[PDB]
Protein backbone atom coordinates (compact mmCIF):
# COMPACT_ATOMS: atom_id res chain seq x y z
CA UNK A 1 0.00 0.00 0.00
CA UNK A 2 0.82 3.71 0.06
CA UNK A 3 -1.97 4.94 2.36
CA UNK A 4 -0.26 6.58 5.39
CA UNK A 5 -2.68 5.43 8.12
CA UNK A 6 -2.30 1.67 7.52
CA UNK A 7 -0.39 -0.61 9.88
CA UNK A 8 0.09 -4.38 10.11
CA UNK A 9 0.28 -6.01 13.57
CA UNK A 10 1.39 -9.60 14.27
CA UNK A 11 3.08 -11.70 16.97
CA UNK A 12 6.10 -13.94 16.40
CA UNK A 13 7.57 -16.46 18.85
CA UNK A 14 11.22 -16.60 19.89
CA UNK A 15 12.97 -18.30 22.84
CA UNK A 16 9.61 -19.08 24.47
CA UNK A 17 8.70 -15.37 24.39
CA UNK A 18 6.36 -13.32 22.22
CA UNK A 19 7.42 -10.42 20.00
CA UNK A 20 4.63 -8.05 19.00
CA UNK A 21 5.61 -6.39 15.71
CA UNK A 22 3.92 -3.39 14.09
CA UNK A 23 4.79 -2.43 10.49
CA UNK A 24 3.87 0.83 8.79
CA UNK A 25 2.96 -0.66 5.42
CA UNK A 26 3.80 2.38 3.27
CA UNK A 27 7.30 2.95 4.71
CA UNK A 28 8.46 -0.39 6.14
CA UNK A 29 9.07 1.25 9.53
CA UNK A 30 8.74 -1.11 12.52
CA UNK A 31 8.05 -0.91 16.25
CA UNK A 32 8.30 -3.98 18.47
CA UNK A 33 7.78 -5.08 22.09
CA UNK A 34 8.61 -8.36 23.81
CA UNK A 35 5.63 -9.60 25.85
CA UNK A 36 5.22 -12.67 28.16
CA UNK A 37 2.27 -14.12 26.21
CA UNK A 38 -0.24 -13.25 23.48
CA UNK A 39 -3.20 -11.61 25.23
CA UNK A 40 -5.89 -9.12 24.22
CA UNK A 41 -4.71 -6.86 27.05
CA UNK A 42 -1.16 -6.70 25.67
CA UNK A 43 -2.42 -6.07 22.11
CA UNK A 44 -4.75 -3.30 23.33
CA UNK A 45 -1.96 -1.59 25.28
CA UNK A 46 0.36 -1.77 22.26
CA UNK A 47 -2.31 -0.30 19.96
CA UNK A 48 -3.00 2.60 22.34
CA UNK A 49 0.72 3.41 22.49
CA UNK A 50 1.08 3.29 18.71
CA UNK A 51 -1.99 5.48 18.13
CA UNK A 52 -0.63 8.18 20.48
CA UNK A 53 2.56 8.41 18.40
CA UNK A 54 1.34 8.02 14.79
CA UNK A 55 -1.95 8.84 12.96
CA UNK A 56 -3.26 5.25 12.98
CA UNK A 57 -6.40 4.87 10.86
CA UNK A 58 -6.54 1.13 10.11
CA UNK A 59 -4.77 -1.99 11.35
CA UNK A 60 -4.45 -5.34 9.56
CA UNK A 61 -3.21 -8.65 10.99
CA UNK A 62 -2.47 -12.09 9.56
CA UNK A 63 -4.47 -13.67 12.41
CA UNK A 64 -7.92 -12.14 12.69
CA UNK A 65 -8.77 -13.88 15.99
CA UNK A 66 -6.09 -11.57 17.48
CA UNK A 67 -8.57 -8.69 17.44
CA UNK A 68 -11.80 -10.29 18.71
CA UNK A 69 -11.47 -9.47 22.43
CA UNK A 70 -13.50 -6.81 24.23
CA UNK A 71 -10.27 -5.18 25.41
CA UNK A 72 -8.87 -4.82 21.88
CA UNK A 73 -12.15 -3.53 20.47
CA UNK A 74 -12.36 -1.01 23.33
CA UNK A 75 -8.85 0.30 22.57
CA UNK A 76 -9.69 0.58 18.84
CA UNK A 77 -12.95 2.34 19.72
CA UNK A 78 -11.30 4.90 21.99
CA UNK A 79 -8.39 5.66 19.64
CA UNK A 80 -10.60 5.83 16.53
CA UNK A 81 -8.94 2.83 14.85
CA UNK A 82 -10.78 0.63 12.34
CA UNK A 83 -9.85 -2.85 11.18
CA UNK A 84 -8.34 -2.90 7.67
CA UNK A 85 -10.33 -5.22 5.38
CA UNK A 86 -8.82 -3.81 2.16
CA UNK A 87 -5.70 -6.02 2.16
CA UNK A 88 -6.52 -9.60 0.96
CA UNK A 89 3.88 -9.36 0.01
CA UNK A 90 6.58 -7.21 1.62
CA UNK A 91 5.12 -7.74 5.11
CA UNK A 92 6.30 -11.35 5.49
CA UNK A 93 9.63 -9.93 4.30
CA UNK A 94 9.90 -7.72 7.41
CA UNK A 95 9.16 -10.40 10.02
CA UNK A 96 11.72 -12.89 8.63
CA UNK A 97 14.39 -10.25 8.02
CA UNK A 98 13.73 -8.94 11.55
CA UNK A 99 14.42 -12.45 12.86
CA UNK A 100 17.64 -12.56 10.84
CA UNK A 101 18.87 -9.27 12.32
CA UNK A 102 17.86 -10.43 15.81
CA UNK A 103 19.98 -13.56 15.23
CA UNK A 104 22.93 -11.42 14.12
CA UNK A 105 22.99 -9.19 17.22
CA UNK A 106 21.71 -11.77 19.72
CA UNK A 107 25.12 -12.42 21.33
CA UNK A 108 25.95 -8.71 21.74
CA UNK A 109 22.83 -8.32 23.90
CA UNK A 110 22.22 -10.08 27.22
CA UNK A 111 18.41 -10.21 27.13
CA UNK A 112 16.24 -11.03 24.11
CA UNK A 113 14.35 -7.75 24.68
CA UNK A 114 17.51 -5.74 24.04
CA UNK A 115 18.42 -7.72 20.90
CA UNK A 116 14.93 -7.05 19.52
CA UNK A 117 15.24 -3.28 19.96
CA UNK A 118 18.77 -3.37 18.53
CA UNK A 119 17.28 -5.14 15.50
CA UNK A 120 14.47 -2.58 15.22
CA UNK A 121 17.05 0.23 15.28
CA UNK A 122 19.17 -1.45 12.57
CA UNK A 123 16.11 -2.12 10.41
CA UNK A 124 14.73 1.44 10.65
CA UNK A 125 18.07 3.23 10.16
CA UNK A 126 19.29 1.19 7.16
CA UNK A 127 19.45 3.16 3.89
CA UNK A 128 17.94 5.80 -0.94
CA UNK A 129 16.27 6.56 2.39
CA UNK A 130 15.72 4.51 5.53
CA UNK A 131 12.34 3.30 6.81
CA UNK A 132 12.70 5.81 9.67
CA UNK A 133 13.19 8.67 7.20
CA UNK A 134 10.35 7.47 4.96
CA UNK A 135 7.67 7.24 7.65
CA UNK A 136 8.37 10.78 8.88
CA UNK A 137 8.30 12.17 5.32
CA UNK A 138 5.04 10.37 4.46
CA UNK A 139 3.28 11.53 7.64
CA UNK A 140 4.65 15.09 7.29
CA UNK A 141 3.55 15.36 3.66
CA UNK A 142 0.09 14.00 4.45
CA UNK A 143 -2.27 16.74 5.67
CA UNK B 1 15.48 24.61 22.24
CA UNK B 2 14.85 24.07 18.53
CA UNK B 3 17.56 21.47 17.81
CA UNK B 4 15.75 18.34 16.50
CA UNK B 5 17.93 15.68 18.15
CA UNK B 6 17.39 16.82 21.76
CA UNK B 7 15.21 14.91 24.23
CA UNK B 8 14.52 15.24 27.96
CA UNK B 9 14.02 12.06 30.03
CA UNK B 10 12.67 11.94 33.61
CA UNK B 11 10.71 9.66 35.95
CA UNK B 12 7.61 10.69 37.90
CA UNK B 13 5.85 8.72 40.63
CA UNK B 14 2.14 7.90 40.68
CA UNK B 15 0.12 5.33 42.66
CA UNK B 16 3.32 3.64 43.86
CA UNK B 17 4.44 3.14 40.24
CA UNK B 18 7.02 4.87 38.06
CA UNK B 19 6.26 6.71 34.83
CA UNK B 20 9.23 7.22 32.52
CA UNK B 21 8.55 10.29 30.37
CA UNK B 22 10.50 11.38 27.29
CA UNK B 23 9.91 14.84 25.79
CA UNK B 24 11.11 16.02 22.38
CA UNK B 25 12.15 19.51 23.46
CA UNK B 26 11.62 21.25 20.10
CA UNK B 27 8.07 19.94 19.51
CA UNK B 28 6.64 19.06 22.95
CA UNK B 29 5.91 15.51 21.75
CA UNK B 30 5.92 12.87 24.51
CA UNK B 31 6.39 9.12 24.87
CA UNK B 32 5.82 7.36 28.19
CA UNK B 33 6.06 3.92 29.81
CA UNK B 34 4.94 2.72 33.24
CA UNK B 35 7.72 0.72 34.93
CA UNK B 36 7.82 -1.15 38.31
CA UNK B 37 10.80 0.82 39.66
CA UNK B 38 13.52 3.26 38.58
CA UNK B 39 16.45 1.13 37.39
CA UNK B 40 19.33 1.63 34.96
CA UNK B 41 18.10 -1.42 33.04
CA UNK B 42 14.65 0.12 32.46
CA UNK B 43 16.17 3.48 31.44
CA UNK B 44 18.57 1.76 29.01
CA UNK B 45 15.75 -0.26 27.41
CA UNK B 46 13.62 2.88 27.03
CA UNK B 47 16.50 4.80 25.43
CA UNK B 48 17.21 2.00 22.93
CA UNK B 49 13.53 1.94 21.92
CA UNK B 50 13.41 5.71 21.50
CA UNK B 51 16.62 5.81 19.44
CA UNK B 52 15.26 3.18 17.01
CA UNK B 53 12.23 5.38 16.30
CA UNK B 54 13.65 8.94 16.27
CA UNK B 55 17.09 10.45 15.41
CA UNK B 56 18.20 10.86 19.04
CA UNK B 57 21.44 12.84 19.33
CA UNK B 58 21.42 14.10 22.92
CA UNK B 59 19.40 13.42 26.07
CA UNK B 60 19.02 15.67 29.11
CA UNK B 61 17.51 14.79 32.50
CA UNK B 62 16.68 16.74 35.66
CA UNK B 63 18.41 14.02 37.75
CA UNK B 64 21.91 13.34 36.49
CA UNK B 65 22.45 10.28 38.71
CA UNK B 66 19.81 8.63 36.47
CA UNK B 67 22.45 8.13 33.77
CA UNK B 68 25.50 6.92 35.73
CA UNK B 69 24.98 3.14 35.41
CA UNK B 70 27.04 0.88 33.15
CA UNK B 71 23.83 -0.33 31.50
CA UNK B 72 22.68 3.18 30.57
CA UNK B 73 26.11 4.21 29.30
CA UNK B 74 26.28 1.01 27.23
CA UNK B 75 22.90 1.78 25.60
CA UNK B 76 23.98 5.37 24.87
CA UNK B 77 27.27 4.09 23.46
CA UNK B 78 25.62 1.57 21.13
CA UNK B 79 22.92 3.94 19.88
CA UNK B 80 25.32 6.87 19.42
CA UNK B 81 23.60 9.05 22.05
CA UNK B 82 25.48 11.74 23.99
CA UNK B 83 24.44 13.43 27.22
CA UNK B 84 23.15 16.98 26.69
CA UNK B 85 25.15 19.46 28.79
CA UNK B 86 23.93 22.53 26.86
CA UNK B 87 20.69 23.01 28.85
CA UNK B 88 21.39 24.66 32.28
CA UNK B 89 11.10 26.13 31.26
CA UNK B 90 8.42 24.39 29.17
CA UNK B 91 9.63 20.93 30.28
CA UNK B 92 8.24 21.13 33.82
CA UNK B 93 5.07 22.28 32.04
CA UNK B 94 4.72 18.92 30.27
CA UNK B 95 5.15 16.67 33.32
CA UNK B 96 2.56 18.53 35.44
CA UNK B 97 0.07 18.92 32.57
CA UNK B 98 0.58 15.20 31.81
CA UNK B 99 -0.38 14.44 35.42
CA UNK B 100 -3.47 16.63 35.04
CA UNK B 101 -4.61 14.77 31.91
CA UNK B 102 -3.88 11.43 33.61
CA UNK B 103 -6.13 12.56 36.48
CA UNK B 104 -8.88 13.51 34.03
CA UNK B 105 -9.02 10.14 32.25
CA UNK B 106 -8.04 7.96 35.23
CA UNK B 107 -11.57 6.65 35.87
CA UNK B 108 -12.22 5.77 32.21
CA UNK B 109 -9.23 3.40 32.32
CA UNK B 110 -8.93 0.33 34.56
CA UNK B 111 -5.13 0.23 34.91
CA UNK B 112 -2.82 3.22 35.44
CA UNK B 113 -0.79 2.09 32.40
CA UNK B 114 -3.80 2.62 30.12
CA UNK B 115 -4.61 6.04 31.59
CA UNK B 116 -1.01 7.12 30.96
CA UNK B 117 -1.14 6.17 27.27
CA UNK B 118 -4.58 7.79 26.94
CA UNK B 119 -3.00 10.95 28.37
CA UNK B 120 -0.04 10.72 25.97
CA UNK B 121 -2.46 10.41 23.04
CA UNK B 122 -4.49 13.43 24.20
CA UNK B 123 -1.35 15.50 24.75
CA UNK B 124 0.21 14.68 21.36
CA UNK B 125 -2.99 15.10 19.31
CA UNK B 126 -4.13 18.42 20.84
CA UNK B 127 -3.97 21.38 18.43
CA UNK B 128 -2.03 25.70 15.25
CA UNK B 129 -0.53 22.21 15.06
CA UNK B 130 -0.29 19.37 17.56
CA UNK B 131 2.93 18.09 19.14
CA UNK B 132 2.53 14.93 17.03
CA UNK B 133 2.35 16.99 13.84
CA UNK B 134 5.26 19.22 14.89
CA UNK B 135 7.75 16.44 15.65
CA UNK B 136 7.17 14.77 12.28
CA UNK B 137 7.54 18.09 10.43
CA UNK B 138 10.74 19.02 12.29
CA UNK B 139 12.36 15.62 11.69
CA UNK B 140 11.20 15.53 8.04
CA UNK B 141 12.54 19.03 7.34
CA UNK B 142 15.87 18.24 9.01
CA UNK B 143 18.30 16.52 6.61
Author numbering:
A (entry chain A), B (entry chain A): 55 to 142, 149 to 187, 193 to 208
Lines from the paper:
HIV integrase (IN) inserts viral DNA into the host genome and is the target of the strand transfer inhibitors (STIs), a class of small molecules currently in clinical use. Retroviral IN proteins consist of three well-defined structural domains: an N-terminal domain (NTD, residues 1–50), a catalytic core domain (CCD, residues 50–212), and C-terminal domain (CTD, residues 213–288).
To assist our comparison of these complexes, we determined structures for unliganded CCDF185K and CCDF185K -BI-224436 forms at 1.9 Å and 2.1 Å resolution, respectively.
